[PDB]
């Protein structure tokens, strides 16, 4: 579990989307494992607008925030789930650290803000779904 909200926005992973999530859809897109659905109250999370590949991340199933180096957003090829198939997720970057199924939405930040949000992982690896490419979040 977890969202990142900012303005009148709330930006989740697309497999944990809820009822309300879809009866006020924004923009969806599997690919990403991203959903954006609006809300009436004025959210305060600053998204990043850079290029960085260190950054910190909240690993819900040990209560602990971790430092990380992550890759660059790219198509990683992701296994079969009750979510997906298997198939190539796009805008996705790698760390080493640690992940369990119950992490996803856990929130990456750098020291300009929120970098992305917990999608995939597995084998000592975490997957984070990037939304700093997503420049209508802010206006
Ligand atoms: C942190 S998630 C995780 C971590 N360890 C083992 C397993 C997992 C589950 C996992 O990777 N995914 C299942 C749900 C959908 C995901 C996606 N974005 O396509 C992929
Ligand atoms: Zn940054």
Known sequence: SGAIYVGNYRVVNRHLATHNDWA????????????????????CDTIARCDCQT????????????????????????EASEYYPARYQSHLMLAVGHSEPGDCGGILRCQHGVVGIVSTGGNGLVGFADVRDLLWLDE
């Open 24 to 43: 006020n859809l924004v923009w969806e897109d599997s690919s990403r494992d991203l959903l954006v659905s609006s809300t009436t109250a004025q959210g």
């Open 55 to 78: 950054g910190v991340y909240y690993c819900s199933s040990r209560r602990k925030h971790y430092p990380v180096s992550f890759s660059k957003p790219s198509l990683i090829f992701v």
